[PDB]
Amino acid sequence: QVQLQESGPAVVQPSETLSLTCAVSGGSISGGYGWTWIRQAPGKALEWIGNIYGHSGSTNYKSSLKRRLTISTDTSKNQFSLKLTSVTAADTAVYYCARWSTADFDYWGQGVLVTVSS
Amino acid sequence: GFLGAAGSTMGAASMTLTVQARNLLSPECQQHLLKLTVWGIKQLQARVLAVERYLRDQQLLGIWGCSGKLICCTNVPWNSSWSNRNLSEIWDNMTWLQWDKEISNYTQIIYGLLEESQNQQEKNEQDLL
Amino acid sequence: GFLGAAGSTMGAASMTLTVQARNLLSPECQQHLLKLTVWGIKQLQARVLAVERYLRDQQLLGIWGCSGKLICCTNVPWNSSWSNRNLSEIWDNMTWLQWDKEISNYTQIIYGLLEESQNQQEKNEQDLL
Amino acid sequence: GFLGAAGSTMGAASMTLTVQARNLLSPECQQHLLKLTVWGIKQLQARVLAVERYLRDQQLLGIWGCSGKLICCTNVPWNSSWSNRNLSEIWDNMTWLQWDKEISNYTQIIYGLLEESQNQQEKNEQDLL
Amino acid sequence: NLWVTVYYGVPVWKDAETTLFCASKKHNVWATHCCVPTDPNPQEIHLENVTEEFNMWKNNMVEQMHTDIISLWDQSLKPCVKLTPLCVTLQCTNVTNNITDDMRGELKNCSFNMTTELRDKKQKVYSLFYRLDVVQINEYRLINCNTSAITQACPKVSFEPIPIHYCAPAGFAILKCKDKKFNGTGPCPSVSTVQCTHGIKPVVSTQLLLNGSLAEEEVMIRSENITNNAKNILVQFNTPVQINCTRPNNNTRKSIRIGPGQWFYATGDIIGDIRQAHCNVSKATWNETLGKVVKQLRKHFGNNTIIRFANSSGGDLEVTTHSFNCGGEFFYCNTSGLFNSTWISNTSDSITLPCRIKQIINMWQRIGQAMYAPPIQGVIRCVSNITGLILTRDGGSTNSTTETFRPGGGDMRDNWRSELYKYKVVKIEPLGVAPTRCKR
Amino acid sequence: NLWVTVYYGVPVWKDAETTLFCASKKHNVWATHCCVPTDPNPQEIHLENVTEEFNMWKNNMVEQMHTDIISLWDQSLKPCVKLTPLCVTLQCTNVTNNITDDMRGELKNCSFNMTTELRDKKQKVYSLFYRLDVVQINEYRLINCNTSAITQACPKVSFEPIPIHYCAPAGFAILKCKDKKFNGTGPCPSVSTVQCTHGIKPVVSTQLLLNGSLAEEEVMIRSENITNNAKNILVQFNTPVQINCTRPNNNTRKSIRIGPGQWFYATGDIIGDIRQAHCNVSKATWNETLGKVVKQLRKHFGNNTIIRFANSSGGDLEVTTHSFNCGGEFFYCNTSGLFNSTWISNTSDSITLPCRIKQIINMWQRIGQAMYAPPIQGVIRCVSNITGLILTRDGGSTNSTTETFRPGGGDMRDNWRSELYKYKVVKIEPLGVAPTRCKR
Ligand SMILES: *[C@@H]1O[C@H](CO)[C@@H](O[C@@H]2O[C@H](CO)[C@@H](O[C@@H]3O[C@H](CO[C@H]4O[C@H](CO)[C@@H](O)[C@H](O)[C@@H]4O)[C@@H](O)[C@H](O[C@H]4O[C@H](CO)[C@@H](O)[C@H](O)[C@@H]4O[C@H]4O[C@H](CO)[C@@H](O)[C@H](O)[C@@H]4O)[C@@H]3O)[C@H](O)[C@H]2NC(C)=O)[C@H](O)[C@H]1NC(C)=O
Ligand SMILES: *[C@@H]1O[C@H](CO)[C@@H](O[C@@H]2O[C@H](CO)[C@@H](O[C@@H]3O[C@H](CO[C@H]4O[C@H](CO)[C@@H](O)[C@H](O)[C@@H]4O)[C@@H](O)[C@H](O[C@H]4O[C@H](CO)[C@@H](O)[C@H](O)[C@@H]4O[C@H]4O[C@H](CO)[C@@H](O)[C@H](O)[C@@H]4O)[C@@H]3O)[C@H](O)[C@H]2NC(C)=O)[C@H](O)[C@H]1NC(C)=O
Ligand SMILES: *[C@@H]1O[C@H](CO)[C@@H](O[C@@H]2O[C@H](CO)[C@@H](O[C@@H]3O[C@H](CO)[C@@H](O)[C@H](O)[C@@H]3O)[C@H](O)[C@H]2NC(C)=O)[C@H](O)[C@H]1NC(C)=O
Ligand SMILES: *[C@@H]1O[C@H](CO)[C@@H](O[C@@H]2O[C@H](CO)[C@@H](O[C@@H]3O[C@H](CO)[C@@H](O)[C@H](O)[C@@H]3O)[C@H](O)[C@H]2NC(C)=O)[C@H](O)[C@H]1NC(C)=O
Ligand SMILES: *[C@@H]1O[C@H](CO)[C@@H](O[C@@H]2O[C@H](CO)[C@@H](O)[C@H](O)[C@H]2NC(C)=O)[C@H](O)[C@H]1NC(C)=O
Ligand SMILES: *[C@@H]1O[C@H](CO)[C@@H](O[C@@H]2O[C@H](CO)[C@@H](O)[C@H](O)[C@H]2NC(C)=O)[C@H](O)[C@H]1NC(C)=O
Ligand SMILES: *[C@@H]1O[C@H](CO)[C@@H](O[C@@H]2O[C@H](CO)[C@@H](O)[C@H](O)[C@H]2NC(C)=O)[C@H](O)[C@H]1NC(C)=O
Ligand SMILES: *[C@@H]1O[C@H](CO)[C@@H](O[C@@H]2O[C@H](CO)[C@@H](O)[C@H](O)[C@H]2NC(C)=O)[C@H](O)[C@H]1NC(C)=O
Ligand SMILES: *[C@@H]1O[C@H](CO)[C@@H](O[C@@H]2O[C@H](CO)[C@@H](O)[C@H](O)[C@H]2NC(C)=O)[C@H](O)[C@H]1NC(C)=O
Ligand SMILES: *[C@@H]1O[C@H](CO)[C@@H](O[C@@H]2O[C@H](CO)[C@@H](O)[C@H](O)[C@H]2NC(C)=O)[C@H](O)[C@H]1NC(C)=O
Ligand SMILES: *[C@@H]1O[C@H](CO)[C@@H](O[C@@H]2O[C@H](CO)[C@@H](O)[C@H](O)[C@H]2NC(C)=O)[C@H](O)[C@H]1NC(C)=O
Ligand SMILES: *[C@@H]1O[C@H](CO)[C@@H](O[C@@H]2O[C@H](CO)[C@@H](O)[C@H](O)[C@H]2NC(C)=O)[C@H](O)[C@H]1NC(C)=O
Ligand SMILES: *[C@@H]1O[C@H](CO)[C@@H](O[C@@H]2O[C@H](CO)[C@@H](O)[C@H](O)[C@H]2NC(C)=O)[C@H](O)[C@H]1NC(C)=O
Ligand SMILES: *[C@@H]1O[C@H](CO)[C@@H](O)[C@H](O)[C@H]1NC(C)=O
Ligand SMILES: *[C@@H]1O[C@H](CO)[C@@H](O)[C@H](O)[C@H]1NC(C)=O
Ligand SMILES: *[C@@H]1O[C@H](CO)[C@@H](O)[C@H](O)[C@H]1NC(C)=O
Ligand SMILES: *[C@@H]1O[C@H](CO)[C@@H](O)[C@H](O)[C@H]1NC(C)=O
Ligand SMILES: *[C@@H]1O[C@H](CO)[C@@H](O)[C@H](O)[C@H]1NC(C)=O
Ligand SMILES: *[C@@H]1O[C@H](CO)[C@@H](O)[C@H](O)[C@H]1NC(C)=O
Ligand SMILES: *[C@@H]1O[C@H](CO)[C@@H](O)[C@H](O)[C@H]1NC(C)=O
Ligand SMILES: *[C@@H]1O[C@H](CO)[C@@H](O)[C@H](O)[C@H]1NC(C)=O
Ligand SMILES: *[C@@H]1O[C@H](CO)[C@@H](O)[C@H](O)[C@H]1NC(C)=O
Ligand SMILES: *[C@@H]1O[C@H](CO)[C@@H](O)[C@H](O)[C@H]1NC(C)=O
Ligand SMILES: *[C@@H]1O[C@H](CO)[C@@H](O)[C@H](O)[C@H]1NC(C)=O
């Protein structure tokens, strides 16, 4: 049904801003779902970044990223996106977008492997 | 615990002023009074009147410079015409009920004098600075 | 005996503050108002409102440290922008009605400053002890 | 601007007492409440009750000698049974909500003692003169 | 040099919108309405200077009277009979016996089937009626049946217009304007403070104001806007005009039990001749009075224009006639005989006004309600003081030819502002500040 | 070392039981009920920490609304017509003209002898009626005659559910819980103080909650006790479901004078075809919505149990149907078409709900009273937001087989606590003591 698909830079340099867009098809961006960013650092377990609701904003961010991280949507393209400023080496991960519903993530994208490197 | 001092001499009863002064502001009815509201009117009138009386006493103490404390000296000489009596004849031998009767007709004389004593005192302080 | 000072200069009228302040709390109807009780409502509303106004004035004097007496100095410098006038120009030549108009738009400025002057004064006393 | 201090330590919150105290006395309905007057009764009851509560607080401060100012020392020793705590443990670390709970069951003990402290103080002044 | 110093008890004020007390027979509604005594009222405090601004056309004391008088009236008559059952088909003929010609067709004699106290029996009763209360079917019905069940005013409720005084509540004061010939607005130079106003008689009327106060010096003509023909002109006379009104015909009253404790009062047979009600106005007095009015009126009109008085054309009784209540009955008198003149702007014993009466009275416009005044036995004799007039302009194109002026009706507010123009209520504001050379 | 020191203005409080003000069309009852303005309300003060304890199931603001709304309703309609005289034997036939099959027997055409304004004449009148208001004798009578004289709601009184706000009186404050997904009880970690609540629309309904607020994030299922089948479950949706309701049939209205100022409104002949009232609920939207509800519901149920939705069996219209008022008319719609599903616990365009209407409405249980809504002319079109549901469990023995759940009725308290759960009112207690190192 719902298909999510990430896109954006594979390589971002240190200190720059990483911007990943997750297109939504097979459903609306405006629905009552938690659009969520999750990343898995290479060799590591999966880590939650934050989310936003299709009908309300009302976001949730990992607190350690709140000063660098913005999550927003664009309803004209039926998409949501992840904006992370001042990236560092520790931010290398494969970033995935997912659709949160009630108790689990019903839908997942493919992910973008992002390397932070000059 | 309330009016037991009303028979004590005025002097002895001066220690119970707190006892009497402290009582001045002392479901189901909640629904009953909102129906047949004449009862509600009577209760509101009673509450309001208690408040008005309270405030007038406070206003009198305010105007005389006696707001705060239960006993204040006002510097108005006692006129021994209002009561040509010794303190040993009244404080030690009379009760407040008797005393109130003894000088009931000077109440308004004294109160006017008390207001002026305060007016002069405030004027003097403002004139000094 | 009441508002005759409203035309006197502010200075002269300072001696009548008592005259006006003292009037603030100033059978048959007893049965009439318990019937056709809308009349009872009007009377209760009037009584209550008089009380509320009275208490708000007292609360303002309380918060500014001017509860008690009719005249108090509050240590807030007069800002000659509120009124860039001499005392001989206002106390001796203006009436209170004129004055009230002259600075009507600073009422809230002054009151906020007065509240803080008192806050600082109480703090200082508590800090001393 | 009102209750934001309710979580601050008691010490920090001592600077907002004015902020909370100042809010205590805070057409069309004019005709609506004179009809279907049960609504008028509810409004009058609310107004009256606010006044009564206000006056009882003032009466308590009056009887304890704390009428005027927001903070007063009353010379009643603190009994470290009511609360066997250090000031650095309560003023610096507890909020007023927590504190009120901590000693809620001594409210009446302290108040009775406060009334007597004042009774003794007034007696002493009258005895001196 | 100077610091804020707070002064409490400062003699200042602001315009107020408040409720006045009322202050003062057994049956009189005002007597029982406000028991608050008044008489010892040398409480008038002259204020030097001040020069307060008044505007009688915006006076909220007038508005208060309107609301309270209507309420008192309705409350007083609410618990009476409620003659709903009287609204039935009537069988009527005219009264044709000891009558004059001016009364032909004026009175009806109607019979009907009225209920009795038992809910199974009827009685045949009759009453005489005035034609103004009865409407022909296509048989007759009472006219009110079109919109309202009506009541019967209680015979034990008195509306004699005894004067009442209004008094301000604590925190408020009333400023009285003593400026002789004050027109009604602006900076009145001479004022005084009272707690209570003088007494005002709550007299209800159209066209001619009765039993009010008289001007202290000269006739006063005042209006909100003298050049606006949409506004009423109030005229206060400095001398009264005597008017003698009567209701001839010695009437009797029946008492019919229509239900278990419900009595209806019917008009019974008339004793003696049946004659028309009327009012007598002194001819010379009226002439002099209008002469004074026009001489004053001319202040606002072109030189040597010609001013006339005219018949009160309009669509109803409360519009075209002089309504009033006296002796308990409601009169509707024809004043066309008074308002008929030309003043030329260069000039060198009883006017009888025919009058009719009614029982089913709506009182204040309204659609429904109405009080059915009960009959009064015997005869009525009333003598009143005409103290003023309410008039309007035509406002047409001007080619000389000044308005021919007409007396008229309006609501009750205009019959009160004519007295209330002297008073304003203000709120006392005792707390204020000024700079002073002092510190704590 | 330390002495009692008294501090006044201390920022503390206790739970309160008080009366809130209400704050805000000409005819709307809430518009005229509370004139107290509200809009400029950035008066929300965030409180750090605090962690106040809430319990929506004990919220006395809900109780206040119940009492005040009923009172306002009754007061507003008390002074209307009081159609006692309409309770007579009716002569009826069915309406059989331009009709559909689903309306056969739905409408009656009844004639009767009505009174006229004169207490001696009758008139033959007729009105169309819905069968739900009319009961056959052994001829017909109005159904209410068994217990009550009924009134006629005034055509000039509007019950459009405009939102109102509640505000605390001085000495009290309202604590708002901002904890997203707060279930309704316990230590809400994030609160703020307001003097006034947000506006709430006083919408009356059963089964489906209309035009309320939506959940900020996800669907919330809350109940006093989730394991007690005697308790209702309130469900708040995070998205609205669009429901389009209509009453076809272009109706007209008669106006019959039944007495002296008493008018009755009858239903006249219908213009065009006579069709059944109904509501349209988006099929996909409803499906998605319940899917979200069950996914949340499962939190409290056994693994992979099977959950179903079912028909609202019960004994009355206010029990089994979706009642609401829109366009001024009272609808009773059949929701069995919505509550019919199995979720399998492993799964991968307009539902039409037939609906009937009534005029004789009791409103709040009760035995007597009832308001006879007058007819509305023309047609009715309503679009509403379904914002939530009220459901119950069966509570039977468990052998897997989870409840088949049913929507249902209840009193109005449950349609308000769904919004009021966010608010608590407390009493401010400014006076208190603490030890301090000082003496006078
Ligand atoms: C402008 O101002 C004038 C002046 O005040 C005013 O006219 C006056 O109106 C009042 C009321 O309409 C008139 O008073 C009535 O007078 C008659 C006549 O009685 C005379 O003789 C007695 C003998 O002792 C004298 O005391 C008295 O003064 C007269 O000389 C009275 O009979 C009237 O009283 C009856 O009616 C009252 C109605 O409320 C009852 O309350 C009262 O109990 C009396 O009722 C009894 O008798 C009735 C007779 O049929 C009977 O039906 C009842 O059941 C009951 O038994 C009343 O006193 C006064 O005389 C008028 N003044 C003049 C000069 O005529 C104008 O009306 C006023 N203008 C306007 C527009 O307001
Ligand atoms: C959930 O929320 C929705 C959204 O608000 C709400 O639905 C709305 O309900 C209201 C009230 O039922 C609807 O308002 C009515 O709309 C009709 C249609 O008028 C249209 O055209 C005019 C032209 O200027 C527009 O202004 C207007 O907005 C519409 O586009 C109006 O005719 C209604 O007014 C009449 O009835 C009122 C009843 O109180 C009268 O007060 C008013 O004076 C009008 O009466 C006159 O006309 C009558 C016609 O026969 C006549 O009988 C009367 O005597 C008199 O002459 C009213 O404005 C609004 O449109 C609905 N919104 C939608 C989208 O449909 C839901 O009801 C709500 N759900 C629940 C359960 O509460
Ligand atoms: C208004 O109409 C009524 C109804 O006709 C008139 O009353 C009627 O008056 C006549 C004459 O007074 C009454 O006749 C009586 O008959 C008895 C029979 O024995 C006789 O003894 C009496 O002397 C008298 O003749 C008649 O009964 C009476 N009707 C009623 C119902 O009372 C009334 O007089 C008319 N009023 C006017 C102003 O015309
Ligand atoms: C409900 O029942 C009433 C009562 O029968 C129906 O009203 C009746 O309708 C008929 C036909 O419209 C009316 O007949 C009229 O007769 C006159 C005679 O000259 C004729 O000129 C008219 O053109 C018409 O034929 C009849 O008077 C009327 N009755 C009443 C009391 O008004 C009503 O239509 C029925 N409504 C429905 C929905 O069935
Ligand atoms: C009421 O009168 C009695 C006397 O009749 C008062 O009694 C006095 O009590 C004190 C107590 O120590 C004694 O010392 C006095 O000698 C008593 N008086 C006499 C005359 O013996 C009593 O105090 C009076 N009133 C009250 C309220 O106690
Ligand atoms: C009202 O204005 C008059 C002046 O127009 C004030 O009269 C003063 O009265 C005192 C009394 O001793 C005189 O010494 C002054 O010289 C008078 N003024 C003038 C200009 O001559 C009067 O005081 C003013 N208001 C009131 C309330 O008295
Ligand atoms: C609510 O709790 C927080 C801590 O959880 C308090 O925050 C303090 O804020 C001051 C501001 O300068 C800091 O110096 C403190 O260090 C903070 N506390 C901690 C533990 O870091 C906050 O003051 C409390 N309540 C209110 C009303 O502010
Ligand atoms: C009171 O009611 C009776 C009964 O209806 C009326 O008298 C009837 O009038 C009709 C008119 O033609 C006659 O045909 C009947 O025979 C009469 N019956 C009786 C018993 O008289 C009577 O006219 C009504 N009276 C009034 C004054 O309205
Ligand atoms: C009452 O008389 C005063 C005059 O004392 C009128 O006030 C004047 O109105 C004209 C109108 O343009 C102004 O230009 C004058 O300046 C006004 N005079 C004052 C002193 O303000 C007042 O309008 C008259 N009011 C009525 C009701 O006729
Ligand atoms: C208005 O005045 C005119 C003029 O006096 C009245 O008309 C005259 O009335 C007398 C009455 O007997 C007649 O004799 C005259 O012949 C009438 N004049 C004319 C020209 O016909 C007129 O009636 C007065 N109107 C009113 C309402 O009194
Ligand atoms: C209105 O009342 C009349 C009078 O009782 C009813 O008509 C009577 O109906 C009975 C029934 O058998 C007949 O025997 C009478 O002859 C009828 N009388 C008349 C004058 O028609 C009439 O049906 C009632 N109408 C309604 C609609 O209820
Ligand atoms: C709302 O959620 C809270 C959890 O934050 C529930 O409170 C818990 O209830 C269980 C029941 O046994 C207790 O053991 C926990 O200690 C409670 N937690 C806290 C923080 O007190 C609460 O019951 C839920 N309320 C509703 C209405 O579902
Ligand atoms: C509940 O769902 C069942 C299953 O879809 C509905 O029954 C079917 O309704 C369709 C409607 O045309 C029929 O064609 C099927 O044959 C029905 N199934 C069976 C087994 O008979 C049932 O009507 C639904 N109930 C409601 C209230 O909508
Ligand atoms: C009753 O009044 C009408 C009014 O014109 C009149 O025609 C009729 O002749 C009058 N009846 C009698 C008996 O005079
Ligand atoms: C009764 O009311 C109707 C309503 O239009 C009106 O036409 C008629 O003239 C009224 N009756 C009278 C006597 O005015
Ligand atoms: C009214 O009656 C009195 C009684 O003496 C009389 O003097 C006066 O002239 C009369 N007035 C008129 C207009 O007749
Ligand atoms: C009133 O004035 C007119 C003016 O011409 C005069 O003719 C008439 O006789 C006067 N009436 C009286 C009573 O003097
Ligand atoms: C006064 O008379 C002259 C004469 O022609 C005229 O023009 C003028 O308009 C008159 N004044 C008024 C105000 O009518
Ligand atoms: C007064 O009676 C005359 C008689 O011709 C009539 O023309 C006039 O319209 C009547 N006026 C009123 C107000 O009744
Ligand atoms: C009226 O409804 C009843 C209900 O069963 C029906 O039997 C009867 O035939 C209907 N009458 C008509 C005319 O359809
Ligand atoms: C009327 O009341 C009786 C009382 O028991 C009841 O049995 C009957 O069913 C009621 N009528 C209707 C239509 O329910
Ligand atoms: C309700 O009407 C609106 C009008 O545009 C429409 O868009 C919506 O889909 C309708 N809803 C249903 C359930 O038909
Ligand atoms: C609702 O869900 C059921 C689950 O099997 C499905 O069969 C049905 O087609 C769905 N309806 C819509 C409108 O998608
Ligand atoms: C979960 O499944 C197991 C399978 O046997 C069952 O025993 C257990 O009771 C189920 N849990 C619940 C809560 O129903």
Residue numbers in the entry:
A (entry chain H): 1 to 35, 35A, 36 to 52, 52A, 53 to 82, 82A, 82B, 82C, ...
B (entry chain E), C (entry chain F), D (entry chain B): 521 to 546, 559 to 661
E (entry chain D), F (entry chain A): 33 to 56, 64 to 141, 150 to 185, 190 to 309, 312 to 323, 323A, 324 to 400, 412 to 503
Manuscript excerpt for this entry:
The HIV-1 envelope glycoprotein (Env) is the sole target for neutralizing antibody (NAb) responses. The development and structural determination of soluble native-like Env trimer mimics, particularly ones based on the SOSIP technology, has provided a platform for structure-based immunogen design. Here, we describe a detailed characterization of neutralizing and non-neutralizing mAbs isolated from two rhesus macaques (RMs) previously immunized with the BG505 SOSIP.664 trimer. We therefore selected three Fabs (RM20J, RM20F, and RM20E1) that bound to different epitopes for high-resolution structural determination.
We solved a 2.3 Å crystal structure of unliganded RM20J Fab and a 3.9 Å cryoEM structure of RM20J Fab bound to the BG505 SOSIP Env trimer. Together these structures revealed the RM20J Fab binds to an epitope on a single gp120 protomer with 982 Å2 of buried surface area (BSA). The CDR-H1 and CDR-H2 make contact with the C2 region of gp120 including residues N289 and T290. A glycan at position N289 would directly clash with both the CDR-H1 and CDR-H2 of RM20J. CDR-L2 makes contact with the first N-acetyl glucosamine sugar of the N355 glycan. Additional contacts are made to the α2 helix of gp120 by RM20J CDR-H3 and CDR-L2. When compared to 10A, a previously characterized 241/289 glycan hole targeting NAb isolated from a BG505 SOSIP.664-immunized rabbit, RM20J binds to an epitope biased more towards 289 and away from 241 in the 241/289 glycan hole, revealing subtle differences in the recognition of the epitope. Despite binding to the BG505 SOSIP trimer with high affinity, RM20J was not able to neutralize the autologous BG505.T332N pseudovirus. Although the hypervariable region of V4 was not resolved in the trimer structure, it lies directly above the RM20J epitope and contains two additional glycans (N406 and N411) that may affect RM20J binding. Comparisons between the glycosylation profiles of the BG505 viral Env and the SOSIP.664 trimer revealed differences in the glycoforms present at positions N355, N406, and N411 with more complex glycans being found on the viral Env that could hinder the ability of RM20J to bind on the surface of the virus and, therefore, render it incapable of neutralization.
